[PDB]
Design a protein around this ligand. Structure first.
Ligand SMILES: *[C@@H]1O[C@H](CO)[C@@H](O)[C@H](O)[C@H]1NC(C)=O
Length: 189
């Protein structure tokens, strides 16, 4: 027989998310340095890919975020003195896989999608450190509008195949999550 075995790729339907509270994971979403890699695909123009902020979310709370806006990828973060928002202008909601690398050291941030030209930006003020107490969310989150200060209204509609932090620290999306909502295999349903 031709039965294949493989590692599940999670699918998100807008009200879906995976949550991580593993200290070994959260410790890499904190401090002055951040390195996020993701491979994803979607047909929806908007959607949250990654988020970690404060709970309860306050107006000037720290956060780091990755998401889609009208097909464009937006890397955003607040370190305590203002938000950086760095966009790679594209139409990545074409239902094909795209890889995004988002890198930050202190205030300075950089995001590269596929082989398109990288875009850079900088958080204002003097704050250089991510000081966040919430769990790490992928593909969406519970009460997304409240917890992101209305920066995102829906989670991802699509799939996420790869998620790496610190260039080298692979996250097993399904197995490493402490919880999930409305998650199924990519392509099923
Ligand atoms: C992004 O691309 C669109 C084309 O779809 C263009 O109209 C728009 O001006 C671009 N944005 C920037 C900031 O160049």
């Amino acid at each position: 027989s031709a039965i294949i075995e493989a590692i599940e790729i999670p699918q998100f339907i807008g009200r879906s998310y995976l949550t991580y509270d593993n200290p070994d994971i959260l410790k890499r979403v904190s401090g002055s340095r951040s390195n996020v890699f993701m491979r994803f695909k979607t047909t929806a123009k908007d959607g949250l890919l990654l988020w970690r902020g404060d709970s309860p979310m306050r107006p000037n709370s720290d956060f780091i975020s990755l998401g889609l806006r009208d097909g464009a990828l937006v890397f955003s973060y607040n370190l305590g003195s203002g938000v950086a928002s760095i966009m790679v202008n594209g139409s990545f909601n074409d239902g094909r896989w795209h890889r995004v690398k988002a890198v930050r050291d202190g205030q300075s941030g950089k995001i590269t999608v596929d082989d398109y030209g990288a875009r850079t930006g900088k958080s204002p003020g003097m704050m250089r450190q991510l000081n966040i107490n919430g769990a790490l969310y992928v593909g969406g989150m519970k009460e997304i509008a409240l917890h992101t200060n209305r920066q995102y209204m829906r989670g991802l509609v699509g799939c996420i195949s790869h998620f790496t932090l610190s260039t080298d620290y692979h996250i097993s999306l399904v197995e490493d999550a402490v919880d999930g909502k409305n998650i199924n295999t990519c392509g099923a349903k």
